[PDB]
Amino acid sequence: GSHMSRSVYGTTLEAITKKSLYDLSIRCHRCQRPLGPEEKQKLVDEKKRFHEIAGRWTGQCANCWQRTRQRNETQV
């Protein structure tokens, strides 16, 4: 609803958003597509924050991000 750009942790989502990471449809802010399981996990895994705008959550999907790591071999 009337919310603003806020970045919080997964454990904070569990309480505020009141649904677990796995269920909660968070989009990649670069793709506008939802995050898969590991992609949601990567943010909590690598200790990133999820970004809310107007009560809509967004993050970054590993689809782009995993491959954004240069020290990942040319296979995937």
Contacts to Zn ion by CB under 5 A: 28, 30-31, 61, 64
The residue among 54 and 64 lying less far from Zn ion, judged by its C-beta, is: 64
Instruction: Please identify, using beta-carbon distances, which residue of 53 and 64 lies nearer to Zn ion.
Output: 64
Q: What are phi and psi of 9, to 5 degrees?
A: -95, 165
SS3 28: strand
Q: In the complex, which residue's CB is closest to Zn ion?
A: 28
Q: How far apart are CA 23 and CA 4, in angstroms?
A: 22
In angstroms, what is the minimal distance from the CB of 34 to Zn ion?
Answer: 10
Min separation Cβ 30 and Zn ion, Å? 4
Give the separation between CA 67 and CA 74, rounded to whole angstroms: 9
